[PDB]
UniProtKB/Swiss-Prot annotation, chain A:
One of its GO terms (biological process) is tricarboxylic acid cycle. Residues 1-814 are annotated as: 2-oxoglutarate dehydrogenase E1, C-terminal part. 2-oxoglutarate binds at residues 183, 208, 607. Belongs to the 2-oxoacid dehydrogenase family. Kgd subfamily. The gene is kgd. Acetyl-CoA binds at residues 625, 641, 676, 679, 729, 736-737. Its cofactor is Mg(2+); thiamine diphosphate. This is Multifunctional 2-oxoglutarate metabolism enzyme. Pathway: Carbohydrate metabolism; tricarboxylic acid cycle; succinate from 2-oxoglutarate (transferase route): step 1/2; Carbohydrate metabolism; tricarboxylic acid cycle; succinyl-CoA from 2-oxoglutarate (dehydrogenase route): step 1/1. Its EC number is 2.2.1.5, 4.1.1.71, 1.2.4.2, 2.3.1.61. Is a fusion protein with two major domains exhibiting structural features of an E1 and E2 protein, and a short sequence stretch of E1 localized at the N-terminus, which is connected by a linker region to the rest of the protein. The chain holds residues 366 to 1227 of 1227 of the full protein.
Swiss-Prot record, chain B:
This is Multifunctional 2-oxoglutarate metabolism enzyme. It catalyses: glyoxylate + 2-oxoglutarate + H(+) = 2-hydroxy-3-oxoadipate + CO2; 2-oxoglutarate + H(+) = succinate semialdehyde + CO2; N(6)-[(R)-lipoyl]-L-lysyl-[protein] + 2-oxoglutarate + H(+) = N(6)-[(R)-S(8)-succinyldihydrolipoyl]-L-lysyl-[protein] + CO2; N(6)-[(R)-dihydrolipoyl]-L-lysyl-[protein] + succinyl-CoA = N(6)-[(R)-S(8)-succinyldihydrolipoyl]-L-lysyl-[protein] + CoA. Shows three enzymatic activities that share a first common step, the attack of thiamine-PP on 2-oxoglutarate (alpha-ketoglutarate, KG), leading to the formation of an enamine-thiamine-PP intermediate upon decarboxylation. Thus, displays KGD activity, catalyzing the decarboxylation from five-carbon 2-oxoglutarate to four-carbon succinate semialdehyde (SSA). Its EC number is 2.2.1.5, 4.1.1.71, 1.2.4.2, 2.3.1.61. Pathway: Carbohydrate metabolism; tricarboxylic acid cycle; succinate from 2-oxoglutarate (transferase route): step 1/2; Carbohydrate metabolism; tricarboxylic acid cycle; succinyl-CoA from 2-oxoglutarate (dehydrogenase route): step 1/1. Homodimer. Interacts with the FHA domain of unphosphorylated GarA. The 2-oxoglutarate dehydrogenase (ODH) complex contains multiple copies of three enzymatic components: 2-oxoglutarate dehydrogenase (E1), dihydrolipoamide succinyltransferase (E2) and lipoamide dehydrogenase (E3). Mg(2+) binds at residues 246, 279, 281. 2-oxoglutarate binds at residues 180, 205, 608.
């Protein structure tokens, strides 16, 4: 008998959520449909079976379905158990009237939006208004914990309602010259109704691509947390900036970026101390039923991936919705982990203007047609329970009518009316930092020569690409800049070239040489910091996060590195929807850097190209900077210009692979100490040597590592009749610098654009069309030397690659 | 009190026993790890109850199943794991050893013979070979038809040799491309009398991107064998066997998207067997930087799949778990995940000393001896084999090592390498009548009834709109015996409420598919055709991957995927770049998949305007894809029929309309379907059928899409006989000959303009502006552009700015 009780308690805790009254439509009729003497007997604390069962039914089988026994941490399971398995105190009349007022403001907003304007049906929150008192309870509970800010990400459903009743934006600002408003960012201040605290509330900008903003929100919050010295990279572990992420039920289950973003939740380089997720689960996705949208019982089942607690709540019970919201914030504060709230509701109207939803879902919409909304239901529930009188119920209808009148009246009144060069001592300091090892630290025998070579390069020259990058980042940290660098195996570097973090051979303790530059020689801090991480095996969420991080902190130097540029197409939605276009669409600025290893080396179509042609196609004046530097010093100056120009614009860099170790691809100390970024580069024989520009009859225009191969052939045959000019900055085209350079070669009879990439790829599709237009006196008659047009970035054979590479060089000097 | 503690102890082992199981062959985490003779209620002693629990849940197998919501599935697993298992026979143990011998010999050979083969090494993970063998042998025991494998490149040539059964002469012929190619073979049971087909699908370097492609390929083969969801039997006799790495399984979103398809009526394959080669590393990255969960397989809890964590140094437990996984898949038609914990013996690649970034792990790996030597030693200790049998096993390894060196040596010396689309009027009338041939007692929605009546009207009288022309093309192909699979977001009804391929009973919710009536001939016999139309999940990457895979699985099928708006297809960029546009040239893998991308400047913003024509034209190379933007319903009909009947496997990219679906000028006559063909270049009807004079034309406007109707309306309003509008219907391959012949009919043309709605850096202009003056210098030298200004987004966010820009384009064209 005692064993049956223990099995019954476990059954309610594990599967009680399957029997809970969570659906306000009660569509599934089989949900509930599919000894007595022992009830008065006491069982081991000592309690009667009737009391054990009543607590279990109220906690797990009422309007809240709790999923938590999947959580591997026993202390988290106990925390939930203790707060859910108790006789809860009824809310005060003032708290109930406050919830009803939020519902009044929410429904008053929806009734206005549909009546006043045309084409607003797709943004309707009708049937889901209970999300407003729920979000209000989340933010109020965050203010109760004394937190600094709540940052919201959401799709467009009920967005202007969120702006008005959550962010607190006035109607004059919302409906000012009223489309793009459903995708813009916003900021406001939330003031507690019954408390004495206030909290900042912001909304991030987003495209129509559902869930794509999810990792952008995480990076944005993480950037704000690092600035406030809270969380993982802060003195306190309060994570005082809270991500509040809203979702639709079909999008939460079908979009892969959801799983990728959940996967970042506890990572040292990406954690935000837990996200509060709210799914507006209207049990439909346009015309699609949940059975065609997901292969699981709940739309939130993906969140079990990180052992997050899940709360399924009845959208027609705003008291349960507000209580679950406050419990979610308390769980997040206690364990610094994600909490998911599944709000079961409905979509009152069609998906859009041309939709009669009974065409595709007749059963659901015959049931929806009998529904009266949460505001009217909750008013009737408070009357029946005896919580409010008829006068209080009438004053609530008067509150609703007044909120409806105020928005119509306020909208009516609105309708009536810099050097990048550093000193030699700076290079030497960064060099010395690589040998300034902590006491008792054991360097790996293969890492030690890299550290010694860096000190050698800093004092004697012949600086390679990898060190030049760290010289740029190190000098920025010394000047007080925050530098965040991440990507797949980025601490060591894919080509074993970076060693930004070195690992103790005996203890595994990490040492970051560039972090020593965050302290001045006098011992005071510079204000700078180096945050370098190995990313998860993700492109979409990682690129999204880094973009979001640069929005959250515009003063930060943010760099994301692809393993190979070929894998950045996994993040195409972030590149297309945020990086390349965010400024023009929403006035949202980003200084994010994308490092894309690129080059034809015979390693196949997925280890050759970062697709230069695609980034050049996306580019428009002032949207991005696109570069492919050929020297370590020019890359150093490119990174320093980017971090110090005071302009928030993304930078796309096509970085080297074998050229990292090319002995000809090295720079002198003077290139770092007495120079600047050069958008156009000439051969050193004309600028520093004894070369004669007047002997040149053939001009080769190129970019990247193929320069060294072209220069080697020129030197081998003593070809004084041929000159090689490098275009370092691909976008914006350096028109003036290119014109001035070409004017120094007056006897040129033919010009050729030389590239490794196929004819339909690289810089030729854009340069071949733009150069004869922007500079007709210089590029009329410009011809192409490249690989043949291909459906892939390269051949799969290293043998075919070698033949094609030699064919390019022979054509250029033929 | 004592009896209650036993019940709580049983639950604890079932729920959390996997956290205490000896699953790591490296044992890196050191913190991981009188009532006995008393009988408890069947009646058994506590020592016997605890021994069953420890052996089942805390030995070399970690079982996760109490998260499964189905009680019958929890019960099935419980009953098979909580029993005194019969020890395998000496012959079965020897067979597992022979597979370890063959796998290890292969790996020693690859690293001694060739250069640059370190990154593909299966050393420390060789137990995946007897595990995969057990999966396929168990599938053959169930009398199944085929196992289709998808995997990354680690151990791929080893899989080809010891799983697929390819010979060394075929594997090492002209020996990196082989690490991505597809393969086919036959598996013959060692102890059984059954055989089963085994295939390997082609894939790019993009980890996990092949996952929905495999599901698609399997589903197409299942449909062909009349097995599964669209079959007569519930066997789902084609089994997907999907291999993964631990870092990629946790980090790539396409994994969750593909798991989300597992039980969907349009996408289910009756369960996938997943094998994660969990070497507890991702290049230089430790699992703590790769995932926010206890296990790399925790994403699979999303669909309530059972998960088995198994010690890679115990090949008996690995083989047993593999067979149990196949039995679970056969019983419940749902995914099973096997997490094989192992290690990576060598560096990730040639330039890696793995002790630089993971010194603790590789000091422990340096003391490891491999699963082959370990299992041989384990069989001696247990007394299962003798020293003579152990020496015979070592001789078997040597024999296998010699054979691969000899066969490749023998190879090196021998080898020297180091149609009309028009239908009859009766076909049109039949498709029209099918829309009104409703089942008995069916109640049509009052707003759907006029659409069905209008389709019968169009079929007999003409003025056929875009939406009906599409169904006329698909319907006629089904009548000719072709399988037609159409899917995408809200594709049954259509995003713009225009398709109604499936209609729903107003009173019962019963679905009716009018085009399915064309799968039966007028005499009552089947045509061999079928219409498979589905609403997809809210995915682009997995759904596009699936449809590409489906066309590979069945080359005779007509496969169409429809984007809600073309603007969202960039969510599937990896599939477009790595499979659709390039699969043929890279691997010789052909696909006839169709992508339908709603496109057009209508003032609905930058995410409801463009399918990015410029990106598809940039990806295109001769013979890779067909790219079209039809302007008329009849030309779209002929485009789809040419595509399905040309006998060529090549992807088709179609930029489809939105408001042009209801443009009353964008309709076609019956004769356009019955006495015509696809026209890559279209002239104005006034010159081909009317009284228009081509000799009066001095200005030629070249265009594509719906803007034609706006240009034609302005020409008619101002009676501009001096201006002609020529449409390029087929954007790629450029119809050079038809374009040249068309332009030659206008001898008094002094200026030519390419007119487009898209910004200057978008649409067809970036490629056409560079290609047309090169391929046709006598016709397009001096060709000028009329378009929107170059933009960082596909359009402005304002419908007001859109309207001003649209009018500006028309005024420039006639200015
Ligand atoms: C990535 C992406 N694919 C497709 C669309 C088109 N789309 C807009 S609304 C919708 C359905 C959304 O369903 P759900 O997530 O349940 O949200 P609801 O509209 O029901 O609030 C779709 C597919 C989109 N905006 N983003
Ligand atoms: C989508 C993608 N991003 C990046 C890479 C580069 N890459 C190749 S191997 C590797 C690590 C794979 O780790 P895991 O999944 O554990 O497999 P393992 O190599 O350990 O077998 C990475 C990131 C890739 N091939 N695909
Ligand atoms: C018609 C189906 O798509 P829509 O609802 O337009 C859609 O993409 C909603 C999301 C948005 O536009 O912000
Ligand atoms: C250096 C890390 O990347 P690689 O291992 O080259 C890689 O992409 C492995 C997957 C493949 O190439 O098939
Ligand atoms: Ca900048
Ligand atoms: Ca074809
Ligand atoms: Mg929904
Ligand atoms: Mg691995």
């Amino acid at each position: 008998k005692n064993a049956r009780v223990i099995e019954l308690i476990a059954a309610y805790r594990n599967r009680g959520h399957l029997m809970a009254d969570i659906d306000p439509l009660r569509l599934d009729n089989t949900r509930f449909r599919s000894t007595l003497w022992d009830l008065d007997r006491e069982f081991k604390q000592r309690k009667k079976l009737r009391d054990i069962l009543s607590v279990l039914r109220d906690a797990y089988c009422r309007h809240v379905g709790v999923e938590y026994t999947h959580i591997l941490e026993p202390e988290q399971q106990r925390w939930i158990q203790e707060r859910v398995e108790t006789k809860h105190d009824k809310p005060t009349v003032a708290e109930q009237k406050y919830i009803l007022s939020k519902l009044n403001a929410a429904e008053a907003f929806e009734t206005f939006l549909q009546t006043k304007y045309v084409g607003q049906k797709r943004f309707s929150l009708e049937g889901a208004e209970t999300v407003i008192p729920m979000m209000d309870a989340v933010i109020d509970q965050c203010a109760e914990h004394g937190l600094d800010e709540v940052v919201i990400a959401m799709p467009h459903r009920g967005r202007l309602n969120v702006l008005a009743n959550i962010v607190g934006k006035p109607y004059s600002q919302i409906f000012s010259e009223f489309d793009v408003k459903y995708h813009l960012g916003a900021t406001g201040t939330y003031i507690q109704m019954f408390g004495d605290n206030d909290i900042e509330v912001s909304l991030t900008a987003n495209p129509s691509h559902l869930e794509a903003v999810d990792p952008v929100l995480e990076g944005l919050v993480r950037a704000k947390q690092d600035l406030l010295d809270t969380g993982e990279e802060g003195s306190d572990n309060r994570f005082s900036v809270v991500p509040l992420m809203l979702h639709g039920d079909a999008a939460f289950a079908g979009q892969g970026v959801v799983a990728e973003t959940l996967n970042l939740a506890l990572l040292r380089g990406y954690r935000t101390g837990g996200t509060i997720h709210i799914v507006v689960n209207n049990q439909i996705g346009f015309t699609t039923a949940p059975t065609d949208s997901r292969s699981s019982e709940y739309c939130t089942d993906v969140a079990k991936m990180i052992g997050a607690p899940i709360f399924h709540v009845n959208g027609d019970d705003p008291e349960a919705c507000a209580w679950v919201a406050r419990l979610a914030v308390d769980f997040r504060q206690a364990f610094k982990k994600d909490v998911v709230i599944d709000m079961l509701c409905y979509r009152r109207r069609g998906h859009n203007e041309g939709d009669d939803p009974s065409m595709t879902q007749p059963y659901m919409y015959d049931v929806i047609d009998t529904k009266r909304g949460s505001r009217k239901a909750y008013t009737e529930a408070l009357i029946g329970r005896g919580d409010i009188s008829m006068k209080e119920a009438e004053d609530a209808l008067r509150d609703y009518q007044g909120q409806l009148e105020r928005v119509f009246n306020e909208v009516r009144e609105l309708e009536k009316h810099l050097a990048t060069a550093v000193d030699k001592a700076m290079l030497q300091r960064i060099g010395d930092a690589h040998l300034a090892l902590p006491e008792g630290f054991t360097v790996h025998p293969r890492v030690r020569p890299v550290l010694e070579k860096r000190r050698e390069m800093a004092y004697e020259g012949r600086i390679d690409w990898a060190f030049a990058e760290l010289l740029a980042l190190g000098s920025l940290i010394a000047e007080g800049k925050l530098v965040r660098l991440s990507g797949q195996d980025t601490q060591r570097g894919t080509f074993t070239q970076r060693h930004a973090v070195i690992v103790d051979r005996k203890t595994g303790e990490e040492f970051t040489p560039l972090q020593l530059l965050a302290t001045n020689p006098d011992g005071t801090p510079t204000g700078g910091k180096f945050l370098v991480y190995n990313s998860a095996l993700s492109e979409f969420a990682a690129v999204g996060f880094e973009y979001g991080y640069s929005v959250g902190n515009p003063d930060a130097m943010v760099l994301w590195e692809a393993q190979f540029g070929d894998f950045v197409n996994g993040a195409q939605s972030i590149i297309d929807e945020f990086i390349s276009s965010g400024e023009a669409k929403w006035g949202q600025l980003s200084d994010v850097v994308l490092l894309l290893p690129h080059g034809h080396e015979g390693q196949g179509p997925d280890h050759t190209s970062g697709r230069i042609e695609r980034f050049l196609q996306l580019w428009a004046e002032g949207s991005m900077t696109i570069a492919m530097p050929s020297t370590p010093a020019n890359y150093f100056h490119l990174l320093r210009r980017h971090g110090k120009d005071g302009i928030q614009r993304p930078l796309i860099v096509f970085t080297p692979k074998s050229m990292l170790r090319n002995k000809a691809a090295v720079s002198d100390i003077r290139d770092f100490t007495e120079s600047k970024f050069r958008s156009v580069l000439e051969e050193p024989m004309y600028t520093d040597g004894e070369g004669d520009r007047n002997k040149v009859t053939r001009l080769l225009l190129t970019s990247g590592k193929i320069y060294y191969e072209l220069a080697a052939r020129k030197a081998k045959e003593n070809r004084e009749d041929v000159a090689i000019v490098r275009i370092e900055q691909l976008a914006p085209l350096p028109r003036r610098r290119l014109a001035e350079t070409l004017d120094r070669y007056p006897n040129v009879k033919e010009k050729f654009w030389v590239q490794e990439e196929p004819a339909n790829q690289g810089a030729w599709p854009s340069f071949g069309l733009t150069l004869p237009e922007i500079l007709p006196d210089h590029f009329t008659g410009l011809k192409r030397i490249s690989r043949r047009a291909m459906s892939a970035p390269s051949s799969g054979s290293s043998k075919v690659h070698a033949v094609e590479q030699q064919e390019i060089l022979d054509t250029a000097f033929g």
